[PDB]
């Protein structure tokens, strides 16, 4: 509720103090990772989502995969962001939100390739068809 | 050191551009990649060391690399790294030509 | 032939001060106190008393040379409390401990003897 009320400063400290007692509540990991994204410490968030996926999900959980994609986007792992959302679309292609995010990552990668003329032909051809 | 170990440790080939970006800055690698004089400077230096190697190989039979000498370069290099806080994790600003000259 | 007479181990000559105050050059609020005609018997107790002072940053002592009847105590204190006043206090309270102990041993004996 403090997080919904916008009090992330205290909410993070609370989620951390709850996490100290147990490593098996994903929401505590997820709440901490969300605040880490909001606090722009994207590496830590990505690390939490990657290990959360490996520990708690016997399959790639699209919710965690999407949270990871949101962090990866900001984390500069555009390659992994692309790959993570392509994996997500491979897992849930009828979920139009994930499909949008795939299209968005293709757009953001192409934006970089298209801005700098140093980008090569295979990159530009991929960027054109991907875009 | 074998000829191969010698080259991989003392030649500094300027054709592996990847290694150059790992080691030197962009403003330093273009001279060793495009300046034929700079390349000859390095090739001459490597040849210089190769010739010194043939010399030492005739100076020191039995391969007794341990020797008694005036200034301790091995230690002195470290002393320099600690005096200037060299931190061997960034690409260096020392243009190889600065070394040869 | 060269034995100093034993009294030279504790008797001060003319002009010799029992204690000498010297400023330290290497750090602020720090002095080196040089006791003449003294040994570990008086120095360790004072050192230990100085360790009780929360405003003493550094305190310890040495006898620069055992054949020299002279000792060097070094005191270093907070900016709001000089090493000199620390020494003053370290003398003021160590004496107090020994005086109270004198009174308690005297009463414990008088209570033990014929009581």
């Amino acid at each position: 509720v403090l997080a919904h009320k916008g009090y992330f400063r205290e909410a993070r400290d609370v989620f951390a103090q709850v996490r100290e007692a147990t490593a098996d509540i994903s929401d505590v990991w997820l709440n901490l990772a969300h605040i880490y994204v909001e606090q722009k410490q994207y590496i830590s968030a990505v690390q939490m989502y990657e290990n959360c996926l490996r520990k708690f999900y016997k399959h790639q959980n699209t919710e965690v995969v999407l949270y990871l994609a949101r962090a990866l986007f900001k984390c500069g792992k555009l390659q992994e962001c692309k790959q993570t959302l392509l994996k997500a679309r491979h897992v849930a292609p009828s979920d139009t939100v994930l499909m949008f995010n795939v299209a968005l990552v293709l757009q953001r990668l192409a934006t970089s390739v298209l801005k700098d003329e140093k980008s090569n032909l295979k990159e530009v051809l991929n960027a054109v068809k991907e875009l | 050191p074998s000829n191969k170990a010698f080259e991989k440790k003392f030649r500094f080939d300027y054709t592996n551009e990847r290694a150059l970006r790992r080691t030197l800055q962009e403003d330093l690698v273009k001279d060793v990649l495009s300046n034929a004089h700079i390349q000859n400077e390095l090739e001459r230096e490597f040849e210089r060391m190769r010739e010194d190697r043939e010399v030492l190989r005739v100076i020191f039979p039995t391969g007794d690399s341990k020797v008694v000498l005036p200034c301790n370069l091995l230690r002195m290099i470290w002393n320099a790294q600690k005096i200037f806080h060299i931190n061997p994790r960034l690409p260096s600003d020392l243009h190889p030509i600065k070394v040869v000259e | 032939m060269n034995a100093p007479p034993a009294f030279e181990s504790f008797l001060l000559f003319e002009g010799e001060k029992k204690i000498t105050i010297n400023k330290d050059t290497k750090v602020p609020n720090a002095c080196l106190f040089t006791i003449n005609k003294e040994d570990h018997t008086l120095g360790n107790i004072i050192k230990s008393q100085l360790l009780k002072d929360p405003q003493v940053l550094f305190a310890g002592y040495k006898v620069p040379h055992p054949l020299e009847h002279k000792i060097i105590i070094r005191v270093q204190t907070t900016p709001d409390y000089s090493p000199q006043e620390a020494f003053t206090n370290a003398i003021t309270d160590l004496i107090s401990e020994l005086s109270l102990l004198e009174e308690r041993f005297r009463v414990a004996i008088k209570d033990k003897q014929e009581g």
């Binding site: - | 008694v68 230690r75 470290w78 002393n79 600690k82 005096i83 | 330290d24 290497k26 750090v27 720090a30 050192k47 230990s48 360790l51 940053l57 550094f58 305190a59 310890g60 002592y61 040495k62 060097i72 070094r74 270093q76």
Partner: protein, 151 residues
């Protein structure tokens, strides 16, 4: 009995200029006998001193600048390692590496080459002692000894 002679000895035969011998280029004065075993004992990884003890040891350093180094172990209560106090003894910025007498020869060959299990492999950097236990191999009258480098 003359200044022309007194000066000549002072500038040619005085002891500190004579630390190293040209005979073998190595030092001829080293930390020896009682203080060498004691320093070895002192340099063990499990040697600890509190401020009441440390401040007694620093009373015997001439070149110490009067500033206590941050203790190697802070909680539950400040503790200094012998090597930590020893770092105050080392002058300036010395940089040397030696192998302690008990160093397993194959300790550098396997893993933990840079983190010696037996606490051997003496390492002095920036005039501070980072690793190893000191003995004749690192403090004696031998080339590459710490005093040789100090000189």
């Amino acid at each position: 009995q003359s200044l022309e002679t007194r000066a000549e000895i002072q500038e040619l035969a005085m002891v500190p200029r004579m630390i190293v011998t040209p005979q073998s280029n190595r030092p001829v004065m080293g930390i020896v006998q009682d203080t060498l075993t004691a320093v070895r004992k002192f340099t063990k990884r499990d040697v600890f001193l509190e401020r009441g003890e440390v401040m007694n040891l620093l009373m015997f350093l001439s070149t110490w600048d009067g500033k206590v180094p941050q203790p190697a172990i802070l909680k539950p209560r400040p503790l200094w390692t012998g090597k930590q106090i020893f770092s105050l003894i080392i002058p300036g910025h010395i940089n040397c590496i030696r192998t302690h007498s008990t160093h397993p020869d194959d300790e550098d060959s396997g893993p933990y080459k840079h983190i010696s299990p037996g606490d051997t492999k003496v390492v002095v950097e920036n005039g501070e002692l980072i690793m190893g236990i000191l003995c004749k191999k690192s403090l004696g009258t031998s080339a590459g000894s710490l005093v040789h480098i100090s000189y």
